[PDB]
Design a binder for this molecule. Sequence first.
Ligand code: CA
Ligand code: CA
Ligand code: CA
Ligand code: CL
Ligand code: CL
Ligand code: CL
Ligand code: CL
Ligand code: ZN
Ligand code: ZN
Ligand code: ZN
Ligand code: ZN
Ligand code: ZN
Ligand code: ZN
Length: 316
Amino acid sequence: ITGTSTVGVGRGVLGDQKNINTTYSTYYYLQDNTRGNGIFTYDAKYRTTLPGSLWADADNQFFASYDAPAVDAHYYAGVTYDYYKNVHNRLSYDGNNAAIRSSVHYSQGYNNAFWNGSQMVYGDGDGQTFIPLSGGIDVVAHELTHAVTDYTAGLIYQNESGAINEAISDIFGTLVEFYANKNPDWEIGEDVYTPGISGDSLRSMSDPAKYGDPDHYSKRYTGTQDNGGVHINSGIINKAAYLISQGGTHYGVSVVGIGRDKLGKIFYRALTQYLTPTSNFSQLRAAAVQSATDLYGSTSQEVASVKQAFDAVGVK
Ligand SMILES: [Ca+2]
Ligand SMILES: [Ca+2]
Ligand SMILES: [Ca+2]
Ligand SMILES: [Cl-]
Ligand SMILES: [Cl-]
Ligand SMILES: [Cl-]
Ligand SMILES: [Cl-]
Ligand SMILES: [Zn+2]
Ligand SMILES: [Zn+2]
Ligand SMILES: [Zn+2]
Ligand SMILES: [Zn+2]
Ligand SMILES: [Zn+2]
Ligand SMILES: [Zn+2]
């Protein structure tokens, strides 16, 4: 909508206060004109119709419980935009400043959130398994990173390529969480999963086996469920990424950590320059090695650590 750029204030799903970029035209709308072609957040009103109505508020204050999922969807879309722009010089998910649209209050008791090819969609959760899922910045950036993948490598959502697709989203979801300083960690979904249980998450990148996901190629899932284990076998790549960044000894292989920024540069270059729709784990290793070689030189610590990390998780 046309109007004046304003700055409102509200509280997110977890009760935290934050400013949000809005647009004033009689009402204050969740329309952020400061990021690309805009960030737009919508009320789906518990329906499955999308996108719903552009979110309108009378006073530019967003402290009602019903407001909280919209506050976070809007703000964390903005943080994800800022990460890709400031860290990777990537403008929105398509690199051409595409508008980022999000709908909250999708369906009823819906324990999921997803990029649907054109926009983000957030359920509210059932209040036991999930609270409104836009409250998790790693979930927001995980799903928006699926869009980045769709506009770059095009990894297919099955078997090893699909597990890479998932791990790329967990890696950059986590790097966005660190970039925001939103109580970062190497867990996924901890802020919105199981409000009655502290200290858990959907999956762990530092210790995938905590939740029964594999942390070594020899423990990969080979059945047909979950599109060939895409949310399971991602643990193998997530652990490799954790080791590249933080270092450690894993199955007797010592990995010298190189930090989060270099992990992100290596995997972003692999994703945008070298991966293809059918890249498998071995080809991801090759792409990460080549990407680190491009960035740091073939004799660098960074290349050596990439090789160590993939050795540690049994990927040659
Ligand atoms: Ca209000
Ligand atoms: Ca997290
Ligand atoms: Ca929990
Ligand atoms: Cl560990
Ligand atoms: Cl471990
Ligand atoms: Cl470790
Ligand atoms: Cl170990
Ligand atoms: Zn998803
Ligand atoms: Zn995903
Ligand atoms: Zn966290
Ligand atoms: Zn998923
Ligand atoms: Zn280990
Ligand atoms: Zn470890």
